[PDB]
Amino acid sequence: LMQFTLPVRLCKEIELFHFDIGPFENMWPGIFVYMVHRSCGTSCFELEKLCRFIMSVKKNYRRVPYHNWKHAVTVAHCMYAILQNNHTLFTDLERKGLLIACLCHDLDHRGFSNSYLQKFDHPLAALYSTSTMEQHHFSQTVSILQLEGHNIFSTLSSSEYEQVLEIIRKAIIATDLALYFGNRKQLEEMYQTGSLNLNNQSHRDRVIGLMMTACDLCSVTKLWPVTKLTANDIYAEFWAEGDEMKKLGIQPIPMMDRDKKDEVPQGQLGFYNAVAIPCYTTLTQILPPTEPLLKACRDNLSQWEKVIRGEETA
Ligand SMILES: Cc1cc(C)cc(-c2nc3cc(NC(=O)c4c(Cl)cnn4C)ccc3[nH]2)c1
Ligand SMILES: [Mg+2]
Ligand SMILES: [Zn+2]
């Protein structure tokens, strides 16, 4: 057989939750196959169809500052780390489906939120009245699966194929941050009343949803230099959207106004308290080995505070 292998440094550090996939685009497909071969197994997919699928997916991500091909592999890598450190808890089909859901979760993103598509009256907002982009991302994933030589799930039974597609659909829809608040609340009560049951399929759904939020925000869990540099790319998109809101004659919300550039450290602080810390806290309670995500989230919170008090620049 042919085993994908990585250089020594990458081979060690890819197992850490805070691994950065680096600036060489041409290595990301190789990194993703390696992660699939070690988390799923070398017999999960025909190598030739996986490669055709990977490259069709890459080709349907856009040249946008943040919601691009590098984000896709980064989110997939965070899922790899979660799966490797909790390997006794997941089914054969869940391993297969979740790295693929992560790779495809932002297909054909143009760098605009669901809210801008509604104010613009984009045709996708007529087709899909909630989770607008996320429903488009899934639809794009099915298109790609149905290309000739691209059905990476060709060996599955008709009913298994339907299950794995249902795992993928739910995990992608869960990346709509508007649904995260509800999902985490439900999971916090279920944890703290002892009702949470991983053999309950609609509970599994909610846990995987939270794993997708954790993976989609994982830039807040990297070393500080990655975290800070990645925040430029995020605001680059947010501010282009806010410009577009202004063109419609609408005042954008604050995070999307490039005039409020100096309030970023405080906005970050707000985001960590209201969203990130709660997310990684609830995930640590449910999956104790994910601890290092929350630890690094706290370190970076502490760094945003240094920036507010002028002991650090950005
Ligand atoms: C200039 C300014 C002013 C005010 C009043 C607020 C903000 C402000 N900045 C915000 C960023 C996020 N989210 C993220 O940074 C994010 C996502 Cl989403 C994924 N990963 N990350 C890291 C959410 C809410 C935010 N409010 C900004
Ligand atoms: Mg998205
Ligand atoms: Zn994303």
Swiss-Prot record:
Q: What is its main location?
A: cytoplasm
Residue numbers binding a divalent metal cation 2 = 106
Annotated 3',5'-cyclic AMP binding sites:
67, 268
Chain sites annotated for binding 3',5'-cyclic GMP: 67, 268
Positions bound to a divalent metal cation 1: 71, 105-106, 216
Q: Name one GO cellular component term.
A: cytosol
State the compartments where it is located: Cytoplasm, Cytosol
Active-site residues, as the UniProt record annotates them:
67
The residue ranges of the PDEase domain are 1-311
Asked if the record carries the keyword Chloroplast, the reply is no
What's one GO MF term for it?
Answer: metal ion binding
Name a single GO biological process. Answer: cAMP-mediated signaling
Keyword set, alphabetical order:
Allosteric enzyme, cAMP, cAMP-binding, cGMP, cGMP-binding, Cytoplasm, Disease variant, Hydrolase, Metal-binding, Nucleotide-binding, Phosphoprotein, Repeat
Question: What tissues express this gene product?
Answer: Abundant in the putamen and caudate nucleus regions of brain and testis, moderately expressed in the thyroid gland, pituitary gland, thalamus and cerebellum.
- Keyword field contains Hydrolase: yes
- Tell me, how does this one assemble? Homodimer.
What protein family is recorded? Belongs to the cyclic nucleotide phosphodiesterase family.
The free-text domain remark for this protein reads: The tandem GAF domains bind cAMP, and regulate enzyme activity. The binding of cAMP stimulates enzyme activity. Composed of a C-terminal catalytic domain containing two divalent metal sites and an N-terminal regulatory domain which contains one cyclic nucleotide-binding region.
Q: What does this protein do?
A: Plays a role in signal transduction by regulating the intracellular concentration of cyclic nucleotides. Can hydrolyze both cAMP and cGMP, but has higher affinity for cAMP and is more efficient with cAMP as substrate. May play a critical role in regulating cAMP and cGMP levels in the striatum, a region of the brain that contributes to the control of movement and cognition.
Q: Which disease is it linked to?
A: Dyskinesia, limb and orofacial, infantile-onset: An autosomal recessive, early-onset hyperkinetic movement disorder characterized by axial hypotonia, dyskinesia of the limbs and trunk, orofacial dyskinesia, drooling, and dysarthria. The severity of the hyperkinesis is variable.
Recorded protein name is cAMP and cAMP-inhibited cGMP 3',5'-cyclic phosphodiesterase 10A
Q: What is the lineage of its organism?
A: Eukaryota, Metazoa, Chordata, Craniata, Vertebrata
Gene name, please? PDE10A
Q: Which residues of the full protein are shown?
A: 725 to 1038 of 1055
